[PDB]
A paper describes a structure:
In contrast to the apo structure, which crystallized with two [name] dimers in the asymmetric unit, the asymmetric unit of GA-cocrystallized [name] contains only one dimer despite having been obtained with the same precipitant. Data were collected to 1.01 Å and the final model has an R-factor or 12.6% with Rfree = 14.6%. In [name], the binding site adopts the shape of a cleft, and the interactions with GA involve hydrogen bonds between GA's carboxylate group and the side chains of R42 and W57 together with water-mediated contacts of the hydroxyl group with the side chain of Y43 and the carbonyl of L128* (* indicating residues of the second monomer). A large contribution to complex formation seemingly results from a π-stacking interaction of the phenazine ring system with the side chain of Y43. While the apo and complex structure are otherwise highly similar (average rmsd < 0.6 Å over the complete monomer), F109* undergoes a significant conformational and positional change on ligand binding. It adopts a different rotamer and moves together with the loop from E103 to G110, which leads to the formation of an open conformation of the ligand binding site with respect to the apo structure. Structural changes in the loop from E103 to G110 establish new crystal contacts, which explains the generation of a new crystal lattice in the cocrystallization experiment. Only one binding site was occupied in the structure obtained by cocrystallization. The other center remains blocked by the side chains of V108 and F109, which adopt the same conformation as in the apo structure here. The structure of [name] in complex with griseoluteic acid suggests that it probably acts as a binder that works in tandem with a membrane-spanning exporter protein.
Author numbering:
A (entry chain B), B (entry chain A): -2 to 129
Write the structure that this text describes.
Amino acid sequence: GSHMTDLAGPTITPNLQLVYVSNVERSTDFYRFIFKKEPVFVTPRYVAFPSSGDALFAIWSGGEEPVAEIPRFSEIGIMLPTGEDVDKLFNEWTKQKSHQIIVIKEPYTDVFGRTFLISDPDGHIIRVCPLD
Amino acid sequence: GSHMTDLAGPTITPNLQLVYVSNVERSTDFYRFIFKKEPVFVTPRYVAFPSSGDALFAIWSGGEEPVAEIPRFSEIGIMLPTGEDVDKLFNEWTKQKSHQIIVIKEPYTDVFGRTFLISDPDGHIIRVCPLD
Ligand SMILES: COc1ccc(C=O)c2nc3cccc(C(=O)O)c3nc12
């Protein structure tokens, strides 16, 4: 070709979503349950789960320990194909008994569509909604 | 009738990384600059950028406004092909003259290799680190 397209560095993508956890074992168990998936990389302080493409979601005990009382300003979002899927997942999580699932917001409509919020063991906010 | 017996729900993936922002237009400009990409969609309150694959990174003014000095317990991560790419990006971002970038931590080798930290306009932590 005549196409010198690789002279400006690698692409810059927010391909990691990382949350600080108090205990990696407990959070690994929690996210295995939420995602119905095994992690792709496991170490005692850092565990990664797949996202789309080359992106990852990771839990890490090397940051600052989360404090329950402190308000949070970001969310771990899970986009499902349809609004029916959102309601089915809410029903599944709130009916099953083994795993504690803390509901923060009941299903409602927001900018995302039909959506609900739960908390993880360290107070991280998880949103379920439809695909864009 | 149906010839399918699969009763599984849809794949559950953390495919939305969402942060709360005070000034959507300001944050749109910031992220357009650091990602060198246009948003997928823009509304007054809600803007998304591509992450990898089908995943998105989004900014939203409809949550709770982030407050300076409230500690944060999560990071927006940017994973690059090599450690050398990490140092090169820090040089690029600190050399350019057109956008203020607040540096939290200059480059160094952590337990996972070369890394640095910056802040976004609303105090969200952004980490640059290596894939490998
Ligand atoms: C923020 O933390 C990380 C980011 C990206 C990584 C790339 O795979 C990564 N890998 C690790 C491998 C071993 C141990 C740790 C640890 O932090 O103890 C790791 N932490 C990592």
